[PDB]
């Protein structure tokens, strides 16, 4: 549906500020959702120091713009910006915006994904060679895929798992999130390895050479 | 034990021969094992026409160097550079060639958990987020650790694995390899995330880096 998706975009807690080709990080993606038209608003988790960098854009692009104040874990920023999306929004689309070069068709198989399953992340296949190693540091004998983002779920899902989460106390790691103890299943939709997350200088440079194609 | 270790040197199959800060990358690890009191001999699996490159030190090293033809697979370089291995070698040291930064202390360590356990491996916490993906896309719900090189092997193990595999017809891929069949524990060595392998022009630049400290 057009209109239909609520984006937080994390740019809180910087490397997401330093800019790729005169453009600070964090508006890539931004602008990328900003031109979809299944994309309603963009809630932007940002330190208000940073908000300027958004608000500057707010008249030109096609997406309600609002913020809301990151918190101590990622999880807890995620929530924060849930509290900010459209009453009616089908789908919350969860990105970091770390993760400048995320393609609009990998955005959009995501949103479909999302919609179809109710939950969907964009992946690629790992590439390195990766084994399961117990507590002795032995390999454990016996496919696996890196995670990106966008993260995608319908809200009423995500609102559950805050539920559960809180009132069982349970424990939330990056790799054990909120829908690991869902039973609703998880969609793996295929990205592109030009999904990369920039962090060290050495990111950039390769951002760098990918945006030159 | 010294003059204990042989170690195969995968240089076969280039990007191992382009210069890291004008020495080949094949070198760097050759130099690194060479030093070492523990590494008798290094066979060298390369095409014939790369071959000057290691001969020319061969009477600068401390080292017996010796040459063996590359295979189809990886494994079959593997088995064509163990038939030329000292016949009283207590242990084989694989290396990817592809792999210049690899540490001393590193190899020291892989070395000498290889020689306790029967079988090791360098390896590092995988950084990124992995999940198990079902053959419908879905995320498998329920620790990770990225593969490098040297993966170190008693002799009579290797002999053993691909004695195994052969009378058998078993199938051998990168991550399901000659010890997967085997019973005997495979260590998991602590190794740094410095010992990357230099395949695209963005791993030069960061291998350059890292040199350079
Ligand atoms: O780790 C996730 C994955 Cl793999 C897929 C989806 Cl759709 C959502 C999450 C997630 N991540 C965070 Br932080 C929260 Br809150 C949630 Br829900
Ligand atoms: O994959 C491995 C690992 Cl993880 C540890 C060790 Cl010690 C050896 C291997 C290996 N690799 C190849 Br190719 C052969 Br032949 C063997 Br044996
Ligand atoms: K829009
Ligand atoms: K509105
Ligand atoms: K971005
Ligand atoms: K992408
Ligand atoms: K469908
Ligand atoms: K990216
Ligand atoms: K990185
Ligand atoms: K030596
Ligand atoms: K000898
Ligand atoms: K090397
Ligand atoms: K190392
Ligand atoms: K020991
Ligand atoms: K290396
Ligand atoms: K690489």
Redesign the pocket.
Known sequence: MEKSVSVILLAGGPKQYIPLLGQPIALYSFFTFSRMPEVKEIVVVCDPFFRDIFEEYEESIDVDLSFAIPGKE??DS??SGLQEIDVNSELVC?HDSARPLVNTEDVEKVLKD?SAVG???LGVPAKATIKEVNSDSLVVKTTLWE?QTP???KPEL?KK?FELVKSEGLEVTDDV???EYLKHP?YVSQGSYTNIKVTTPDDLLLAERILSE
Request: proline share 0%; charged share 5%.
């Open positions: 990622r999880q995620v929530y969860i999302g939950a969907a992340v995670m993260q995608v779920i995500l798992g999130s909120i829908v998880v």
